[PDB]
Amino acid sequence: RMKYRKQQRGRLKGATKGGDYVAFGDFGLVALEPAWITAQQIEAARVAMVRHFRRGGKIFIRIFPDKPYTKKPLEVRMGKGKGNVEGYVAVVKPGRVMFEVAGVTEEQAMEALRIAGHKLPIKTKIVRRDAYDEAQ
Amino acid sequence: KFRVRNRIKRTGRLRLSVFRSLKHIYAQIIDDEKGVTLVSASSLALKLKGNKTEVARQVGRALAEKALALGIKQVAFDRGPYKYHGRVKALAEGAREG
Amino acid sequence: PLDLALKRKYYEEVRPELIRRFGYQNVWEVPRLEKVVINQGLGEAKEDARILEKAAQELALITGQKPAVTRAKKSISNFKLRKGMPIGLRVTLRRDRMWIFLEKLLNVALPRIRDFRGLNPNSFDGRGNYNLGLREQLIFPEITYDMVDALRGMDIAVVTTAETDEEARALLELLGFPFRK
Amino acid sequence: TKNGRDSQAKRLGVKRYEGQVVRAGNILVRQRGTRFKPGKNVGMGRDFTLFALVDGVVEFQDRGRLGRYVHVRPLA
Amino acid sequence: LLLECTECKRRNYATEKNKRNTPNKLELRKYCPWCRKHTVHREV
Amino acid sequence: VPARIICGCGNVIETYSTKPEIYVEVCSKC
RNA sequence: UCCCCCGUGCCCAUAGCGGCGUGGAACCACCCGUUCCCAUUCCGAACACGGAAGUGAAACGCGCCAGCGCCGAUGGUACUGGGCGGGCGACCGCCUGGGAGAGUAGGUCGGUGCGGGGG
RNA sequence: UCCUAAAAGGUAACGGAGGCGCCCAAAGGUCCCCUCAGGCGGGACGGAAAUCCGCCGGAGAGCGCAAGGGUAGAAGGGGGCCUGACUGCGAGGCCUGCAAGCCGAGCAGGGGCGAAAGCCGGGCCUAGUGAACCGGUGGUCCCGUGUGGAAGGGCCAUCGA
RNA sequence: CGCGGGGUGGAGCAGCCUGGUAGCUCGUCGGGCUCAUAACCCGAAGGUCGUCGGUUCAAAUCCGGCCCCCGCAACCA
RNA sequence: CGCGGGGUGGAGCAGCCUGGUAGCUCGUCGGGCUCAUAACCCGAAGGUCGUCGGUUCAAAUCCGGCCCCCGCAACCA
RNA sequence: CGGAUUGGGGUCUGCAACCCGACCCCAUGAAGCCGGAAUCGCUAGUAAUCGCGGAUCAGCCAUGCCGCGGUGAAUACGUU
Ligand SMILES: [Mg+2]
Ligand SMILES: [Mg+2]
Ligand SMILES: [Mg+2]
Ligand SMILES: [Mg+2]
Ligand SMILES: [Mg+2]
Ligand SMILES: [Mg+2]
Ligand SMILES: [Mg+2]
Ligand SMILES: [Mg+2]
Ligand SMILES: [Mg+2]
Ligand SMILES: [Mg+2]
Ligand SMILES: [Mg+2]
Ligand SMILES: [Mg+2]
Ligand SMILES: [Mg+2]
Ligand SMILES: [Mg+2]
Ligand SMILES: [Mg+2]
Ligand SMILES: [Mg+2]
Ligand SMILES: [Mg+2]
Ligand SMILES: [Mg+2]
Ligand SMILES: [Mg+2]
Ligand SMILES: [Mg+2]
Ligand SMILES: [Mg+2]
Ligand SMILES: [Mg+2]
Ligand SMILES: [Mg+2]
Ligand SMILES: [Mg+2]
Ligand SMILES: [Mg+2]
Ligand SMILES: [Mg+2]
Ligand SMILES: [Mg+2]
Ligand SMILES: [Mg+2]
Ligand SMILES: [Mg+2]
Ligand SMILES: [Mg+2]
Ligand SMILES: [Mg+2]
Ligand SMILES: [Mg+2]
Ligand SMILES: [Mg+2]
Ligand SMILES: [Mg+2]
Ligand SMILES: [Mg+2]
Ligand SMILES: [Mg+2]
Ligand SMILES: [Mg+2]
Ligand SMILES: [Mg+2]
Ligand SMILES: [Mg+2]
Ligand SMILES: [Mg+2]
Ligand SMILES: [Mg+2]
Ligand SMILES: [Mg+2]
Ligand SMILES: [Mg+2]
Ligand SMILES: [Mg+2]
Ligand SMILES: [Mg+2]
Ligand SMILES: [Mg+2]
Ligand SMILES: [Mg+2]
Ligand SMILES: [Mg+2]
Ligand SMILES: [Mg+2]
Ligand SMILES: [Mg+2]
Ligand SMILES: [Mg+2]
Ligand SMILES: [Mg+2]
Ligand SMILES: [Mg+2]
Ligand SMILES: [Mg+2]
Ligand SMILES: [Mg+2]
Ligand SMILES: [Mg+2]
Ligand SMILES: [Mg+2]
Ligand SMILES: [Mg+2]
Ligand SMILES: [Mg+2]
Ligand SMILES: [Mg+2]
Ligand SMILES: [Mg+2]
Ligand SMILES: [Mg+2]
Ligand SMILES: [Mg+2]
Ligand SMILES: [Mg+2]
Ligand SMILES: [Mg+2]
Ligand SMILES: [Mg+2]
Ligand SMILES: [Mg+2]
Ligand SMILES: [Mg+2]
Ligand SMILES: [Mg+2]
Ligand SMILES: [Mg+2]
Ligand SMILES: [Mg+2]
Ligand SMILES: [Mg+2]
Ligand SMILES: [Mg+2]
Ligand SMILES: [Mg+2]
Ligand SMILES: [Mg+2]
Ligand SMILES: [Mg+2]
Ligand SMILES: [Mg+2]
Ligand SMILES: [Mg+2]
Ligand SMILES: [Mg+2]
Ligand SMILES: [Mg+2]
Ligand SMILES: [Mg+2]
Ligand SMILES: [Mg+2]
Ligand SMILES: [Mg+2]
Ligand SMILES: [Mg+2]
Ligand SMILES: [Mg+2]
Ligand SMILES: [Mg+2]
Ligand SMILES: [Mg+2]
Ligand SMILES: [Mg+2]
Ligand SMILES: [Mg+2]
Ligand SMILES: [Mg+2]
Ligand SMILES: [Mg+2]
Ligand SMILES: [Mg+2]
Ligand SMILES: [Mg+2]
Ligand SMILES: [Mg+2]
Ligand SMILES: [Mg+2]
Ligand SMILES: [Mg+2]
Ligand SMILES: [Mg+2]
Ligand SMILES: [Mg+2]
């Protein structure tokens, strides 16, 4: 990334804008609980997904961490934390669409998204597609 | 361009918009904060001869007669992006002389 | 001094031809030659304010007008110039002194140019103007050989109501501009 | 560390409001730049301080491009 | 540099601030005394 | 003054410059 | 009364840009010229002066067209003074009054005041 | 200076991030004039970037110096003249526990710029600093130990954190 | 990890304070003396100034973070 | 701030006192010479003498002021 | 001064001159203003300087070698 060092904590209110719709791909993965998703978590689900169905299609990772995860190294209170230990996270509130696959089979999707779900700390659901966009 | 205009717009009353054509010279006494002209002494759109500068004088005096009549005297002048030098000069000049 | 060749050349020759190659309606539509400018990138005349006046005064003759000064503004760290104290040489001439200059141009300067080949018909500003480049400033008439302490170069320009480089090309050609075809 | 610094509160903003009585010289509004322009019987100084030049009530008048002018309507 | 401006043929002072090396050596700027009115004031 | 370009090839134009005696050559006449 | 145009102010983009059209007798600009007032660190381009001829090209006035810009519902919704309940926590919900933003339908290539000239 | 600060103000932590301890006689005052950065297209050295030309380009430049706010319907760019970086003042009001800080109409003397209206009691503004005591230097309607005078002191000015 | 000092041609080291223009010694390369080598003499070449971002007309030099090096400190329980 | 000493070639010093003399050492370039550096020997460029000013026939010289360094005791609300 | 380089044309030897001949004519006019440390040759018709011939051989890349004549020096205290 690139901006500046540290950032605030900030609570995780209503699952408002933290939640969208299946914009790309065919299937999707939604969050049910609100929390910070770690970089290690993104990749974990990423690798898990793509590794499952070798030579997989296209895996869309809508979310994206940019919140400097702060933390102190086993001491006391001399100023603000160094953070960066775990790295960064993303504001993930219920309704969000972390991942979504395409150009692949439904079985590949259902199982993958399932596994990648375990890579996530939040309880999750798997939505198909429907037609819910915004048109006439 | 019209900086000067804004300057005297906060000065007082009785502005003297001296708009002049390439051959004409209109003189209007417009009071701001309402938008009404009092003594509007035109030039080539009035009666006078054909001598821009000299005409500027006679029209300046035209303002005088009508101005003093209504009791107006606040000589709040309005350059109107023009250089006080030639025609516009005789306006306030002859009008303030008489 | 309102009288010369290039004058009535535009009047009784170019004007009608511009009504031919394109055709118009109003006289104030046909491309009229009106603006001509000069310039000299004088990063050289930075150290030497002496050499600065020389170029200016020389110019005074070849232009038949009054030289001017236009320094820089940015800051060429690479080539010793900053604030904008140094110098650039500009001079814009119009009306008669303009016509008299162009006469010398295509009848004196251009003629005796180092392996002259004509004017590059691409140097149009995409619209209806032209921009040319010259080196030796002595190609001009009055400039004597034993007077130039440097073959200082310079570039000029010419603005016209012309909106298309085709109209411009035709105009300039009719004016008497030997365009390297 | 090295961050705990801050110039104390200057306490600017709107000092007087529309529909208020004012003497002569009452600092209408102290502003940073020029978020509020003068007008009818109102002038400013070095720090762009807005104050009354007459005696009456304060009034506001938003004028988009022009600006958010504020005046005072004299009466007695 | 801290500058002080005296008066001509009298004995009055004024508050000032000159420039050490910067192109500033003397101060011949007119002023205004209390005795009489408006006479030039030398640096000094 | 009428600059008489005395170019060495048979052309003497009456332009306007300094010193009507402007000795030139290889102009538009050759 | 009403219409075209000139000056100037208000409303401060539903008046802005842009393509098209259109008006010169009048009004306006350009335009002729640089002797005098005066001027461009170079130019009468700008500012200035004296004033006929020419055009409406430039600028502007008026009108059209919505592509851009701009204005923008309604409906529901987010959030929320106030009152109340549920979960370990992260949080969630109901009653009461309030109620955006975004997106949709859609609106607009102006309206208006005083004075001056002309029918 | 900003955020934290929860839409008036205020508001804490060894909370996040950055400045000041200056500078300018022109970077001031008045008068008149002027308009950005960039992007594209065109042009002798240059050529990402000097300078010149055309069209676009409403503020993303500039505004001495951090940031915020403001700003071309000028606070910015230039020229002319000038020294209001004036004395004696001060209705009213911001701020505030005290003290300190901050804005200022208008009056008088006198003076600058402009035809005038009018503006000028420094710098677009918010940091660029230090109660009091002690003493220094200039000045002065004052005091001066019985009396003239001197020493010394007070008063206005200004100096050493 | 707390505080201080330091990364510059192949080796060691100056220049940073006081922004514009990398200096010295050894070595390396070419040439000479010698039968030959060293010593000695003649000339040449050789750097990204650790790193990334920032400040500036412009950064080895100014500011900040990271990385590596050296020194000091790390107590009362 | 008060007192006194001086600024002299790329650099320092004698000349100053009590004016008629820019000289000395080293560097540096060319010449002599040597196996070689050096010693040593010949010649040479570079100083408005920090500045401005005054007296005199002539001022580095004697003197006034101005700029700077260095020294001196003292001082600090 | 200097003649390197190079464009174009042409001459002759030889089956044949791209690689590779010599030569001529026109144009082109390079470095070089006397040479760093170091080093070479000669004691008189010598050094220096100038031209000539031959072997070689179709021709010739010959500034090479061998031979010949023209002009015509300087200094040699001494043996460290
Ligand atoms: Mg990145
Ligand atoms: Mg939240
Ligand atoms: Mg992990
Ligand atoms: Mg799970
Ligand atoms: Mg965890
Ligand atoms: Mg599940
Ligand atoms: Mg003629
Ligand atoms: Mg026509
Ligand atoms: Mg000139
Ligand atoms: Mg000549
Ligand atoms: Mg021709
Ligand atoms: Mg704090
Ligand atoms: Mg604190
Ligand atoms: Mg605080
Ligand atoms: Mg405090
Ligand atoms: Mg038309
Ligand atoms: Mg028409
Ligand atoms: Mg003239
Ligand atoms: Mg006349
Ligand atoms: Mg005259
Ligand atoms: Mg002129
Ligand atoms: Mg004009
Ligand atoms: Mg006339
Ligand atoms: Mg007509
Ligand atoms: Mg017409
Ligand atoms: Mg039209
Ligand atoms: Mg209209
Ligand atoms: Mg909307
Ligand atoms: Mg809405
Ligand atoms: Mg629609
Ligand atoms: Mg729409
Ligand atoms: Mg329109
Ligand atoms: Mg109306
Ligand atoms: Mg009619
Ligand atoms: Mg009718
Ligand atoms: Mg706040
Ligand atoms: Mg608050
Ligand atoms: Mg924090
Ligand atoms: Mg200062
Ligand atoms: Mg100024
Ligand atoms: Mg000013
Ligand atoms: Mg300008
Ligand atoms: Mg640009
Ligand atoms: Mg380009
Ligand atoms: Mg270009
Ligand atoms: Mg360009
Ligand atoms: Mg050159
Ligand atoms: Mg360029
Ligand atoms: Mg370019
Ligand atoms: Mg470019
Ligand atoms: Mg200013
Ligand atoms: Mg100015
Ligand atoms: Mg000025
Ligand atoms: Mg005066
Ligand atoms: Mg203060
Ligand atoms: Mg007064
Ligand atoms: Mg002021
Ligand atoms: Mg300031
Ligand atoms: Mg300030
Ligand atoms: Mg007294
Ligand atoms: Mg006395
Ligand atoms: Mg007494
Ligand atoms: Mg006393
Ligand atoms: Mg002091
Ligand atoms: Mg080191
Ligand atoms: Mg060291
Ligand atoms: Mg290192
Ligand atoms: Mg090195
Ligand atoms: Mg090393
Ligand atoms: Mg080193
Ligand atoms: Mg060393
Ligand atoms: Mg350092
Ligand atoms: Mg360098
Ligand atoms: Mg070196
Ligand atoms: Mg060394
Ligand atoms: Mg070595
Ligand atoms: Mg060595
Ligand atoms: Mg070596
Ligand atoms: Mg060696
Ligand atoms: Mg070797
Ligand atoms: Mg060995
Ligand atoms: Mg080297
Ligand atoms: Mg570095
Ligand atoms: Mg460098
Ligand atoms: Mg190291
Ligand atoms: Mg113990
Ligand atoms: Mg003593
Ligand atoms: Mg002593
Ligand atoms: Mg010595
Ligand atoms: Mg020696
Ligand atoms: Mg001296
Ligand atoms: Mg002297
Ligand atoms: Mg002491
Ligand atoms: Mg040939
Ligand atoms: Mg020979
Ligand atoms: Mg042979
Ligand atoms: Mg034979
Ligand atoms: Mg013997």
What does the block give as tokens for C7?
A: 């004058």
Q: For residue B5, which of B24, B19, B21, B20 has the smallest C-alpha distance?
A: B19
Helix (H) or strand (E) holding A115: helix A106-118
Query: Which numbered ligand comes closest to the C-alpha of C26?
Result: 8
Residues D46 and D20: beta-carbon distance below 8 Å: no
Q: Under an 8 A CB cutoff, do D3 and A79 touch?
A: yes
Output phi, psi for F22, to 5 deg.
-95, 100
Going across the sheet that includes B15-17, the strands are B36-41, B27-31, B15-17, B77-78
Separation of alpha carbons C144 and C140, rounded Å: 9
Residues from chain A contacting residue D5 (CB–CB below 8 Å)? none
Give yes or no for CB of B76 within 7 Å of strand G.
no
F2 at C interface, C-beta within 8 A: no
CA of C138 to the centre of ligand 79 (A): 59
Cα–Cα nearest to C134, from C160, C108, C159: C108
User: Which of chain D's residues 17-76 bind strand G, using a 7 Å CB cutoff?
Assistant: 61-66
User: What SS3 string covers chain F?
Assistant: CEEEECECCCECCEEECCCCEECCCCCCCC
Query: How remote is the C-alpha of A42 from its chain's centroid?
Result: 6
Write the single-letter amino acid at F2. P
Chain G nucleotides near the protein (CB, 7 A):
6-13, 27-31, 33-34, 37-38, 41-45, 47-52, 54-58, 78-80, 90-93, 103, 113-117
Give the three-state DSSP class for B8: helix
Distance from CA of A76 to the nearest CA of D (A): 13
Q: What is the resolution of this structure in A?
A: 3.2
Which DSSP string do the residues of C53-84 spell out, in sequence order?
A: HHHHHHHHHHHTS--------S--TTTT--SS
In SS3 terms, C138-178 reads as: HHCCCCCCCCCCCCCCEEEEEEECCCCHHHHHHHHHHHCCC
